[PDB]
């Protein structure tokens, strides 16, 4: 399960529990996503189209 994630002519990829600090504001949803043992990238994700897996996970309804 990864989610694909393309910021330009890079493709990355990010792992859904390895992102651990998230918090949901505004439209994009904010997150971090740890890589680098330091660095500690940073990015967002409009909810346009977000996973399925995403939303069950943390959106746990029944």
């Given at each position: 399960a990864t989610v694909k994630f393309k910021y330009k002519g890079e493709e990355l990829?990010?792992?859904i529990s390895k992102i651990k600090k998230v918090w949901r504001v505004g439209k994009?949803?904010?997150?971090?996503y740890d890589e680098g043992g330091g660095k500690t990238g940073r990015?967002?994700?409009?909810?346009?189209?977000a996973p399925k897996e995403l939303l069950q996970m943390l959106e746990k309804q029944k």
């Open positions: 990829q990010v792992d994009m949803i904010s997150f971090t990015g967002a994700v409009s909810e346009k189209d």
